[PDB]
Design a protein around this ligand. Structure first.
Ligand SMILES: [K+]
Ligand SMILES: [K+]
Ligand SMILES: [Mg+2]
Ligand SMILES: [Mg+2]
Ligand SMILES: [Mg+2]
Ligand code: NA
Lengths: 198, 129
RNA sequence: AAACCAUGACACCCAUGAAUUGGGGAACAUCAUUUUAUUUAUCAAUUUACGUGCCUACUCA
RNA sequence: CCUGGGGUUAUGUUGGUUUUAGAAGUCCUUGGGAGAUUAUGGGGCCGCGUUGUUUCGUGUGGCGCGCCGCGGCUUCCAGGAAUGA
RNA sequence: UGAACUGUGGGCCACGUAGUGUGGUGCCGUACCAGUCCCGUCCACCUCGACGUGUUUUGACCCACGCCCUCGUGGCCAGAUACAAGAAACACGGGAGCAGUUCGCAUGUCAUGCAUGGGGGCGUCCGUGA
């Protein structure tokens, strides 16, 4: 069927139900939508994952796609996620690019040759930007408590509070699921002067 | 120009505790600075501290509880054999009952009491008591 | 040379009130036309306020 | 990564002539799956006309998304992956 | 004598801790808010339908003790993903005291022939490193 062209070639023989359902929606969005009609026929996804918790009653749907289409997705986002959420009630849809990480070598000569996009620090901060994409990070803090615990807090602009606050508890869960690290969120009115909202 | 980030940071903390301040701002930060502060905090000498990100070398805000008498760096970083711990304790510490000398070893940055337990030498970084 | 601050150069921290020399911002002048919040507070979510003199019968907004 | 093409042994032993095949390189072609950066970038040959989710107190109230133009052909083209200032 | 950066992971129990938020459960007395009545116009009181404070569990930080993890994501359920020049890929009986470890009959008989009968580690060379 023509709708299978929206999946990676390896998954076309025996697709899963979630992958098949997403592929069907994308193909219908291809010929129906006006803005999405362009830039869609060059796109295909890798896999679809689903997560949930006893709290955060909504379900998280994570879609991974090849890194080449990151420029394509950036212009298309804020509309693809809106339409996908309409066709999947009860779920929150996230688009994340699949990236590779190079383990830190031990020799100084080998370390000097490592490509910096494949560094673990660079990869994790890019996955965070893939989440909450229409907003951007305006600040970041690390707190070291008296016990060995360490916390990382990420601040967002308070102007986007009405459009992103509902998804913050679920997006922290997805970030932990992908990177095995925890993040806390805050809002900053007047980020220039470092004023925290309350 | 500034030649040692660690020496600069330890001078700011010791100066603030002499004046009886509650908080101190340290700039710039580094990996060695954070590890040194984590050793002090584990033994209960400073308290909570926070790192601020600015896409350059960061900044640190430290809370002081008034228990720290003096801290300082040792320049240059002399080598210390595992049998030489008593010589350094006798020279730069108030007594043999309290206070720590901080070393950098192949197992990481640690105080001289832990290094003796693991039987490792290294290079002396500083002290606090 | 009393070639003197009789005080080597570079870098960090450092309490208070009046002044002063150059540059900039606010002001004057010229143009243009957050939720909240009945039952609150542990280190505040906005202390940003304010006028004068000279000035084409031009080294000048 | 794969399949279909082209153009030193071992013959009883030693010494000579001659080959069949490999392998290699070297040009075409089918199968498959990848890609850390979108085959849709340029012309011309030109012609035509110029109500569905989601918050918030069943419901209310907020919700965001949606509700020189077209056209077929052709040739050329790697020009976006780089810690930060 | 000389600035910063590539990075130190996560689950599952258990149980004495173990800080914090979020919600449960009852809640004498005190205090607060909202009602009712009442005095005063410059300074006062009564009686109720809730919020607090104080309990008691949950739950997330913390230390001690065990287990597990392809120990980010992805991909299988032997190959690829990473790592291994103490490695990979060829070969040597003059290579392992008989060619290592693991799933009486034959040859010879003019003989002291009195002889001989999957995968992984050994030794020795040759191509492969950025
Ligand atoms: K002189
Ligand atoms: K001057
Ligand atoms: Mg002199
Ligand atoms: Mg510069
Ligand atoms: Mg250095
Ligand atoms: Na003088």
């Amino acid at each position: 069927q023509p709708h299978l062209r929206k999946l990676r070639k390896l998954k076309r023989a025996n697709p899963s139900q979630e992958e098949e359902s997403v592929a069907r929606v994308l193909f219908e969005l291809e010929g129906s939508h006006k803005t999405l009609r362009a830039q869609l026929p060059r796109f295909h996804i890798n896999t679809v994952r689903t997560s949930s918790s006893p709290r955060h009653k909504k379900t998280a749907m994570i879609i991974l796609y090849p890194l080449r289409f990151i420029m394509l997705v950036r212009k298309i986002q804020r509309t693809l996620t809106a339409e996908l959420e309409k066709r999947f009630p009860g779920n929150i849809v996230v688009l994340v690019a699949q990236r590779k990480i190079t383990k830190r070598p031990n020799d100084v000569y080998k370390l000097q040759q490592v490509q910096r996009s494949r560094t673990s620090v660079a990869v994790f901060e890019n996955i965070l930007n893939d989440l909450i994409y229409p907003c951007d990070v305006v600040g970041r803090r690390w707190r070291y408590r008296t016990d060995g615990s360490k916390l990382m807090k990420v601040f967002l602009d308070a102007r986007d509070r009405k459009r992103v606050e509902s998804r913050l508890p679920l997006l922290a869960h997805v970030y932990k699921l992908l990177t095995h690290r925890t993040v806390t969120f805050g809002f900053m009115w007047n980020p220039k002067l470092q004023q925290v909202s309350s | 120009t500034m030649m040692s980030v660690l020496a600069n940071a330890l001078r700011c903390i010791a100066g603030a505790e002499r004046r009886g301040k509650r908080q101190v701002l340290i700039r710039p930060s580094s990996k060695v600075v954070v590890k040194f502060l984590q050793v002090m905090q584990k033994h209960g000498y400073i308290g909570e501290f926070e790192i601020v990100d600015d896409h350059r070398a960061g900044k640190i805000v430290v809370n002081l509880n008034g228990r720290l008498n003096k801290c300082g760096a040792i320049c240059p970083r002399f080598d210390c054999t595992a049998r030489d711990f008593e010589k350094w304790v006798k020279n730069i510490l108030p007594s043999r009952q309290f206070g720590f000398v901080v070393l950098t070893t192949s197992l990481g940055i640690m105080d001289h009491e832990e290094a003796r337990a693991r039987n490792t030498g290294g290079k002396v970084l500083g002290f606090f008591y």
